[PDB]
Design a protein around this nucleic acid. Structure first.
Lengths: 103, 114, 159, 205, 78
RNA sequence: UUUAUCAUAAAAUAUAACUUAUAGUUUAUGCAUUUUAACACAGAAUAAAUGUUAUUAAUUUGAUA
RNA sequence: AACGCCUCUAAGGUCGUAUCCGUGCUGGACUGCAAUGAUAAAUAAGGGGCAAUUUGCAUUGUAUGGCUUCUAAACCAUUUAAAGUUUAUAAUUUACUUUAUAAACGACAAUGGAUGUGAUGCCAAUGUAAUUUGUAACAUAGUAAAUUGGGAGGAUCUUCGAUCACCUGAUGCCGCGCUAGUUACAUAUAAAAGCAUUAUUUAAUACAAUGACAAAGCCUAGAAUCAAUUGUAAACGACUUUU
């Protein structure tokens, strides 16, 4: 499950040429938060983690343009949450979608 | 042929599987002019009895089927059907011929009391 | 001691694997761990010995001395009346697929296995014979109580 | 399905001996076979555990010395302990006997449709027809755990998942037969119905 | 067992398979020719448990191992 | 051999009394009854089962030709 | 315990190594597996999916002599070659749990099978095969189906896995077509003269599967690489980056 808005710094792992492109990721499959979805799209996709899964890991950017490099293209990383009763882990990860976490 | 769509044809004992018991035919006439020699294909005279004649392909000279044969067919299948309904309807007596052998569970090709 | 089959004189045993297959013999004595004597007068088996792995045991003891000759086993075999109470033994009916389902000629089969469509076409339409929660009524049974009036009253349709 | 018998013969591995179930299956797979053996963590091995400990621990020290990666790859599942057998019993260096292990799928912990499809027992290879009293046996469940199989309690919890919903699909079916034995009552006056089958069975009435 | 495969001795077994060509007409009762058959005849018994040998017309190309041949039921003693 | 007849033996277990034992049983620690697979060669009687002699009934038996 | 007794052992439980096995760590079924994102050019026309596809041609795979079919509904919940299993019953109890009492089965014939283990089809014919055959009379039984919102429901390298089966709100009225039995009646079909017929066993019907064409609406409007740059990298490729 992805958050709907993502930084242009950090939709840049998904491209090997970004100047050249038309910037079309994640343009389609981020409309799932704007359709009905409450019976169909995403609340099912968060139901699935409460029941089947055992390990919930979370996906994070790094705001690398604060680092002043010539790089401008992010680093995506799966961090595992480790707090109990994975009913918690799906609500912790549903809170902190699109919101920063600092060291 | 009325029942099973099968005329008075002629088969070997090699191509046939005789079941256990009988059907009673105690007073059947078996109208003995149905000889083996009586029923060749008649014939291919190599052309139309004139001797040394012409031909085009795809002739139909072998299968009417015979008008006299349809009188012999309605004689037996009259008299056979008065018999075969009067049997005790067992496994193979009345509507009981009419289905297409392919066998089933717990039974045989090997070593049966067939 | 849950009183299993005992090899004891003369526990009545029905043989399989050897040439006395299908014969109800009587034990007379014990020769070995693995062999016994055997004597069934009424079932037609004279006094042999027999490999114990071949004969299987039934619930029928009968009393003789262990030194008995056949004539007094024969006296005892009829006196306790085995012959009538064995052909009703509760799975000696299940012997008789040997006399009925074994080879079941092809002057038997079709009739005996065409009625299984007769029986089943009257069984599947004996389904949705339903009580479980619907009851009542499970719409669209506005139309089907007319069909279900032919289960209850049944004059004439619904309703 | 349809084939030389079906397109599968599902065998439960529970309670069977590892090498008699192998040479039955490697013979049948060369007949044109299609087996699919499930529950491989349950195959019994003869001898006690410290007999088969030592023998699997000797087959893993056989590695190449020049470069160990080339040397015998020692697979540690239970289903690969058994698939290793059915390659000793198959001509696996031929294009005939390589299509004979490509009929063999072998699973350990009975998944995905081989949990509704009927699976059968091979009484020639059962333990309790073959192995005596007093004789200790093993299971390939604990052999693979003590030689490094990291998924033993994975599949034990997955078993209890499909053991648990088996009780939901039997209590669907235990009462449903109770409907049939009531549905059997209304047909005793069908026409002349049951007489033609009961006169050849009758032992189940 | 060997009394079982002693039934089939003498039966014209056939091995049936397919090929890309027709190359031939329907000459006797209608022939499409996509199906090839090598006719044979079962000869004797083989195993001690009911396998069987069969001499064929040509000789069975051995990528036919494990593929079905059809033992016929004709020519039949009863 | 086996079935069968004979005469005696001598009777080693099985039908065929009633002990005691055993627990479960009742009634007031015993009895009353119940299973004795505890079961007193505990007895009678029977099997003359077993023991002796002899003969055999479609004279019964296989293998070997 | 054997072996009236002792005994670390025969059955059973334990204590336990710098060893062994695993984790941690490095490589990754070279090119395994899962998740995911985008899905072209054009925007006139096209190209690309949806798709059973609806519309034909035409092939393969097949049940191949109408169906030598099968079903993709179960037989323990540590185990024990006598080992015990079911069944009611009474109590107990989430539970066929637990317990008692009583049964059956006597490791047979049988059960390794057809309980065809939600009870298979071997077909609606009321003449059934390499096509389908019609209509009344009588008896019981009495199905199968098609349109609308909320829930609970389902993931093991999948035969189609953001869908999904049941169930309630509720739309509605098939009242289209059920079937079994008894009896009557209405036709059509079917016969390849081969009378010691088989052959490179066709093939259908149907099932399913693509394939390609003119045929059929919908949906769709991205990238990678090279070249240039970088210097976290460098023999070369390759990797990290940038417009």
């Amino acid at each position: 499950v992805w958050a709907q808005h993502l930084s242009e710094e950090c939709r840049r792992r998904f491209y090997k040429n970004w100047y050249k492109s038309k910037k079309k990721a994640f343009t389609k499959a981020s409309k799932k938060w704007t359709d009905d979805l409450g019976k169909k799209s995403i609340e099912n996709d968060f139901r699935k983690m409460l029941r089947y899964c055992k390990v919930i890991r979370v996906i994070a950017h790094s705001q690398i343009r604060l680092i002043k490099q010539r790089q401008k293209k992010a680093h995506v990383m799966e961090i595992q949450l480790n707090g109990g009763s994975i009913e918690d882990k799906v609500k912790w990860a549903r809170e902190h979608l699109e919101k920063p976490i600092q060291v | 042929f009325a029942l099973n769509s099968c005329p008075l044809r002629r088969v070997s004992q090699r191509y046939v599987i005789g079941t256990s018991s009988k059907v009673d035919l105690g007073a059947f006439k078996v109208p003995e002019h149905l000889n083996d020699a009586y029923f060749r294909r008649l014939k291919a005279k190599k052309d139309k009895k004139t001797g040394e004649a012409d031909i085009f392909a795809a002739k139909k000279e072998r299968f009417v089927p015979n008008e006299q044969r349809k009188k012999d067919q309605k004689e037996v299948d009259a008299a056979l059907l008065k018999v075969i309904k009067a049997h005790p309807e067992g496994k193979f007596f009345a509507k009981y011929l009419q289905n297409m052998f392919a066998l089933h569970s717990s039974q045989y090709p090997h070593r049966m009391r067939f | 001691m849950p009183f299993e089959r005992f090899v004891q004189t003369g526990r009545i045993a029905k043989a399989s694997a050897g040439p006395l297959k299908g014969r109800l013999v009587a034990i007379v004595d014990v020769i070995d761990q693995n062999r016994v004597l055997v004597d069934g007068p009424l079932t037609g088996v004279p006094r042999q010995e027999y490999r114990l792995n071949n004969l299987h045991l039934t619930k029928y003891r009968i009393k003789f001395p262990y030194t008995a000759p056949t004539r007094i086993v024969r006296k005892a075999w009829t006196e306790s009346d085995l012959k009538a109470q064995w052909k009703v033994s509760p799975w000696s009916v299940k012997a008789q697929n040997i006399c009925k389902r074994s080879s079941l000629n092809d002057f038997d089969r079709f009739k005996l296995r065409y009625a299984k469509r007769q029986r089943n076409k009257l069984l599947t339409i004996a389904f949705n014979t339903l009580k479980k929660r619907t009851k009542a009524d499970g719409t669209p049974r506005v139309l089907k109580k007319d069909r279900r009036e032919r289960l209850r009253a049944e004059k004439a349709k619904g309703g | 399905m349809t084939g030389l018998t079906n397109r599968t013969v599902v065998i439960d591995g529970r309670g069977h001996l590892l090498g008699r179930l192998a040479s039955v299956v490697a013979k049948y797979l060369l007949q044109g076979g299609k087996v699919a053996v499930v529950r491989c963590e349950e195959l019994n091995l003869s001898g006690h555990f410290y007999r088969n400990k030592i023998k699997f621990l000797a087959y893993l020290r056989k590695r190449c010395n020049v470069n160990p990666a080339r040397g015998p790859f020692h697979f540690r599942a239970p289903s690969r302990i058994f698939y290793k057998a059915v390659r000793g019993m198959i001509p696996h260096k031929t294009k005939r006997g390589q299509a004979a292990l490509a009929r063999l799928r072998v699973f350990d912990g009975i998944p995905s449709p081989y949990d509704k499809r009927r699976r059968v027992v091979v009484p020639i290879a059962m333990r309790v027809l073959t192995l005596r009293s007093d004789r200790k046996y093993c299971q390939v469940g604990r052999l693979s755990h003590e030689v490094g199989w990291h998924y033993q309690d994975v599949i034990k919890s997955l078993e209890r998942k499909r053991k648990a919903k088996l009780r939901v699909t039997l209590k669907h079916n235990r009462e449903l037969k109770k409907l049939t034995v009531k549905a059997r009552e209304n047909i005793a006056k069908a026409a002349e119905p049951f007489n033609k089958i009961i006169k050849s069975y009758g032992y189940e009435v | 067992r060997k009394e079982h495969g002693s039934f089939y001795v003498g039966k014209r077994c056939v091995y049936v398979y397919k090929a890309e060509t027709k190359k031939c007409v329907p000459q006797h009762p209608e022939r499409k020719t996509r199906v090839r058959a090598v006719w044979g005849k079962v000869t004797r018994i083989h195993g001690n448990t009911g396998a069987v040998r069969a001499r064929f017309n040509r000789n069975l190309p051995g990528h036919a191992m494990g593929h079905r041949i059809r033992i016929m039921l004709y020519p039949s003693r009863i």
